[PDB]
Amino acid sequence: SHMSAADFEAAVAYVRSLPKEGPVQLDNAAKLQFYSLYKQATEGDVTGSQPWAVQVEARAKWDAWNSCKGMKSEDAKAAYVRRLLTLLRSQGIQWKPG
Hints:
CATH topology: Acyl-CoA Binding Protein
Pfam families: ACBP (PF00887)
GO cellular component, one term: ciliary plasm
Keywords: Lipid-binding
Domain ACB: 4-93
Number of helices: 4
Protein name: ACB domain-containing protein
CATH architecture: Up-down Bundle
Strand content: under 5%
């Protein structure tokens, strides 16, 4: 019937298996938001040096992770799940973790 932070692992797996063309549209900015929350939730604060700007994807990822600094694991888990629920509802789709 409804979800919580405890649905994080299922949400991550849902995101990772979204096809490139499908009823769910996942834009590049949303990909980075999910990435950053994933990393915060599973590793805590960003580490390592800011990547070279030429490595455009790696740099973007790290910068998104850095934007989450200080967030507790459980809060990042909650945020990731709430963002998927928002994405799905906005596009008229129901999630059933099962």
